[PDB]
Inverse folding.
DNA sequence: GCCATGACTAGTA
DNA sequence: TACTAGCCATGGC
């Protein structure tokens, strides 16, 4: 567990994904088995979504996944039930994560998301139809949804 | 733990 | 559409 940095180029620009050999700690969209394993998935999602499940998801070494919380399930459930292309409501996820009367929490849960794109906090959307917000600029949410096949 | 937060909502004018 | 009065697991201290 040393936590080193490996940057990479994506159609969204460079994106620094840090982490130790125990797992992936982060993956920031700026303007060591795990990391290089995550690196593969990323290039796969991007230039080869035709079979993104053909690629193993790395280990998530980060305080949010180590303990047991709502934010936990919400994130865990976000990448296990919301597949490539699919879209889901803040609330609808809160259902998956147990407490359905807690969508607003699924929000703080989403911002708490360290591994975007890997854990698609972008497929998440306001029930009102409006494709809500995103930490790394709403622009990115557009492209992503878009690339997944949206208009 | 209590009290303030904010990437949510369904309801109402 | 535009404001709102519930509903929430966090974070702070």
């Amino acid at each position: 567990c040393e936590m080193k940095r490996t940057t990479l180029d994506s159609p969204l620009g460079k994106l620094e994904l840090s982490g130790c050999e125990q797992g992936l700690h982060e993956i920031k969209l700026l303007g060591p088995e795990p990391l290089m394993q995550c690196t593969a998935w990323l290039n796969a999602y991007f230039h080869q979504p035709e079979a993104i499940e053909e690629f193993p998801v790395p280990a998530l070494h980060h305080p949010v996944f180590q303990q047991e919380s709502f934010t936990r399930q919400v994130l865990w459930k976000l990448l296990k039930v919301v597949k490539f292309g699919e879209v889901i409501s803040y609330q609808q996820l809160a259902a998956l994560a147990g407490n359905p009367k807690a969508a607003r929490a699924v929000g703080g849960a989403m911002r708490g998301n360290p591994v975007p794109i890997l854990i698609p906090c972008h497929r998440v959307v306001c029930s009102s139809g409006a494709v809500g917000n995103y930490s790394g600029g709403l622009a990115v949410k557009e492209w992503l949804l878009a690339h997944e096949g949206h208009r």
Remarks:
- Residues 89-91, 94, 102-111, 121, 124, 126-128, 132-135 of chain A lie near DNA strand B (CB under 10 Å from a C1').
